[PDB]
Design a binder for these strands. Structure first.
Lengths: 155, 119, 69, 257
RNA sequence: UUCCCGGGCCUUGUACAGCUGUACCGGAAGGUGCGGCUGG
RNA sequence: GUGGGAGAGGGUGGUGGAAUUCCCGGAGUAGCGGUGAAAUGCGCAGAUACCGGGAGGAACGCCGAUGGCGAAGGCAGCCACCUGGUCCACCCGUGACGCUGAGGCGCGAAAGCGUGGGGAGCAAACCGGAUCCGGGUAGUCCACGCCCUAAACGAUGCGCGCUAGGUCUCUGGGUCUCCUGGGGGCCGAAGCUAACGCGUUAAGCGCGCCGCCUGGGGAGUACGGCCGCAAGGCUGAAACUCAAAGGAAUUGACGGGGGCCCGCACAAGCGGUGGAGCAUGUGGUUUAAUUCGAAGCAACGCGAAGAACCUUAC
């Protein structure tokens, strides 16, 4: 876009929980436009969380969400045909975007046979602070704040 | 080996190279550093990275002699002045005063062809 | 603010009254431009000469060292 | 184009004569040259430009191609290799100006049994023109290129042939290698050194040049002045007045003193 | 909107940095030193 | 004439430091130095970065300005002496004593020469490297003699009188927010100009005197003369050749180089292609024929929205 600000689409909150984060999550799980299958996967996963872990899985999901939420990002810059991975602030929207994206890819990355168990294990572990998504977040953070000398490139 | 524990640092930051040297209050140097001792050769010696390195190299060979407090006096108009400054500032040392001491001519000797055409 | 306004009555040609002359010097031993000093053309010109005289006598610095970043 | 006809006319090339070409390039020169000489041999260096040359010269058979520079090659080797029955040899090189200046001399100090050269130079440096002593054009280079040969510019050329558009005018100069040195020489080295000593500062007087530029000199003020006295050369005369015979005599004088 | 590609509109040089006095060029489709000018 | 003013105007005699280089000591040492990149080069008799003490040369950083002075070229550290020009106030004195100026005489950036000194830095020519960098003689500096050129330009000769104003600035004087002189710029009446533009600092209206032009090239060339030690300078043609050579300004073009804005152009994402098998089109080979066309985007599941016979053109 060159003129507009590309207004953010307001997602319809989920039915059972009345929450928008759950809707966003199930949307991110989606492949080939199969909503029902993704919702079933999520519901099975949360039921597994409930059986295994005493408390309501809604809170554990949210806690994992702000657990795997970063603050710094490195972006490329093209000055004199050279790369400048300048660190930069992330808006809450962007924060949420990468958080959900990492969560879903990490869920798909597990070696467990079933998708539901994979996503459940990733969710619980990310809540704890271990797993692929978390390790990737500290990866990007340590990639950031290590080239603070480049901070003058405000961009 | 000197145990002066308090000296002054001099930074010659040129276009092509940056050299840092630590000395006693008297003015007898104890150690230096240069892009060259790091291992960089050619253009990259002038590049501030080599400054980021010889920066602390000074400091290290200085902790080696047990110096704590430092006075920083910088010379030249090199690209890697300020980053070298922040460097030997946070190399683990208490900097007292930092001053720019770039020596300018009082319209004396005629420079190179590259440095003429000044109006 | 301009230096000239925030002063009292004084002499320009007096090359010995150091504590007024220094206030016409920067942190480095340089004569301020007309903008900073707010002096007329003739008084600036005579002030330059007085500065040079007192400066040769050793009362004023040829240069000073700015203490900053 | 078509300047080639007039240059060849000033080459006085015959059927009995052979020709060496140093900068043939596209072979346009060689093209119009072929119809006049029995033997044409071309030195060539550009690996890029050679393949395009090879096929284009197919119509004419009397051509020969040599793939090394004039600098690091024995010209006499080639002359003996190909020119066994040929009477004399001409050279019609038209190569870039900044390359031509050393090679022409190099062909000269080696004293190959070649008669003369017809070559393109800049107008201003036409072997420094006629090298008449009392002139701006007169030089050390002139002294070199009349000590070994007789040179004259047959004509000049404005406009362009090869390049889109130049800035300066050009000329063509014609040469004959002389049988012997102009005047007797006690040493080549000393003679050439004396030439450079005289021409080191053109504007300064000859006496000053000899005293300063020449080694020692300061200790031999009286000696130099005396010898130039017996030489019948005035001290305040400049280098640009002395001629070949003069310099010879002066060189003879300076040695043995 | 920095960059890659492709367009539109508005601005400047040559076609339907340059010049110049002088002094030199044995790697002269010109080069350099000392100045000077905008007729950039 | 009296009373005052400003100023890199000039000449002479001296001293103030910043910086570069070299030398003598201290301490320290694996490289300094350079380009878009690199390479020559300096260093174990220990370089650069550093501190202290000396030597010598040249120039004068901020002030410094679009500013000032001079007839031009030109002139900036500071002090002292000698000296030129100029401006204003008083309206005191002489009573036209004025303007211009062929020749002459003097001055004349830089570069260059001679007789002697000096030489830090920079640098023609020259010595080396990859094909701009490192050194380096003359020179740049001083004294005395020559040389006398230029985009020596405001491309505008000098003096005087008249012809609306506005604004900025330098320097004087008054009855002080203004009035009245002398300089330096910018917009503009009338007017002038081919136009650009000029416009009380005229390129307007006029008068006086001097210099210069008679189409381009040849050519500031040839011969002669004068000057100079020399390079060269001043004066300055013809034969021959062309029908143009030029000055402004308009429209447009190509890349000069910038400004701005748009496009799933980039970026931020999702899914693909290039790896595999198969279908189709095409290049090239092969064949008796493999009919023919389409060729960057904008040809290549295109003509062909149906080739076993027809279609079919081989």
């Amino acid at each position: 876009a060159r003129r507009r600000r590309a207004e953010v689409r307001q997602l319809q909150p989920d039915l059972v929980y009345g929450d928008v984060l759950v809707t966003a999550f199930i949307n991110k799980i989606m492949r080939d436009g199969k909503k029902n299958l993704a919702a079933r996967i999520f519901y099975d996963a949360c039921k597994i969380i409930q059986e295994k872990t005493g408390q309501e899985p809604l809170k554990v999901f949210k806690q994992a969400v702000e657990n795997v939420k970063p603050r710094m990002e490195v972006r490329s810059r093209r000055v004199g045909g050279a790369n400048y991975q300048v660190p930069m602030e992330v808006s809450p929207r962007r924060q949420q975007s990468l958080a959900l994206r990492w969560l879903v890819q990490a869920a798909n990355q597990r070696p467990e046979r079933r998708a539901a168990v994979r996503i459940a294990h990733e969710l619980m572990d990310a809540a704890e602070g271990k797993g692929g998504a978390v390790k990737k977040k500290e990866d990007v953070e340590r990639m950031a704040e290590a080239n603070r000398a480049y901070a003058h490139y405000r961009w | 080996k000197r145990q002066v524990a308090s000296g002054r640092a001099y930074i010659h930051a040129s276009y092509n190279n940056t050299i840092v040297t630590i000395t006693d209050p008297d003015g007898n140097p104890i150690t230096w550093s240069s892009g060259g001792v790091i291992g960089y050769k050619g253009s990259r010696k002038g590049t501030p990275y080599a400054a980021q390195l010889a920066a602390l190299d000074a400091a290290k060979k200085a902790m080696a002699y047990g110096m704590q407090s430092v006075d920083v006096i910088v010379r030249g108009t090199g690209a890697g002045r300020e980053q070298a400054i922040r460097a030997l500032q946070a190399s683990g040392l208490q900097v007292k005063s930092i001053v720019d001491d770039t020596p300018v001519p009082h319209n004396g000797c005629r420079p190179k062809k590259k440095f003429r055409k000044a109006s | 603010a301009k230096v000239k306004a925030t002063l009292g009555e004084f002499d320009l040609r007096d090359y010995r009254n150091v504590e007024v002359l220094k206030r016409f010097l920067s942190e480095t031993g340089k004569i301020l431009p007309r903008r900073r000093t707010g002096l007329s053309a003739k008084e600036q010109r005579i002030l330059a000469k007085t500065i040079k005289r007192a400066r040769i006598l050793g009362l004023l610095p040829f240069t000073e060292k700015l203490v900053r970043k | 184009t078509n300047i080639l006809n007039r240059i060849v006319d000033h080459a006085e090339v015959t059927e009995k004569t052979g020709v060496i070409e140093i900068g043939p390039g596209i072979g346009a020169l060689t093209e119009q040259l072929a119809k006049r000489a029995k033997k044409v041999v071309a030195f060539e260096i550009d690996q890029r430009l050679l393949p395009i040359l090879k096929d284009t010269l197919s119509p004419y058979e009397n051509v020969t191609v040599i793939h090394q520079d004039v600098l690091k090659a024995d010209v006499k080797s080639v002359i003996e290799e190909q020119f066994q029955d040929c009477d004399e040899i001409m050279v019609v090189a038209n190569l870039p100006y900044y390359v031509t200046t050393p090679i022409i001399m190099k062909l000269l100090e080696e004293h190959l049994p070649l008669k003369g050269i017809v070559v393109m130079l800049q107008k201003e440096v036409a072997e420094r023109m006629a090298a008449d002593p009392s002139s701006k054009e007169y030089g050390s280079l002139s002294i070199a290129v009349q000590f070994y040969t007789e040179a004259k510019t047959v004509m000049i050329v404005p406009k362009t042939v090869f390049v889109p558009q130049p800035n300066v005018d050009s000329a063509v100069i014609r040469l004959i290698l002389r049988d012997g040195p102009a005047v007797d020489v006690e040493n080549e080295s000393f003679f050439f050194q004396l030439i450079k000593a005289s021409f080191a500062q053109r504007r300064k007087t000859l006496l000053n040049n000899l005293v300063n530029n020449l080694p020692e000199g300061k200790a031999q003020k009286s000696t130099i002045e005396q010898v130039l006295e017996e030489t019948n050369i005035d001290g305040k005369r400049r280098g640009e007045s002395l001629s070949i015979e003069e310099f010879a005599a002066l060189s003879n004088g300076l040695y043995k003193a």
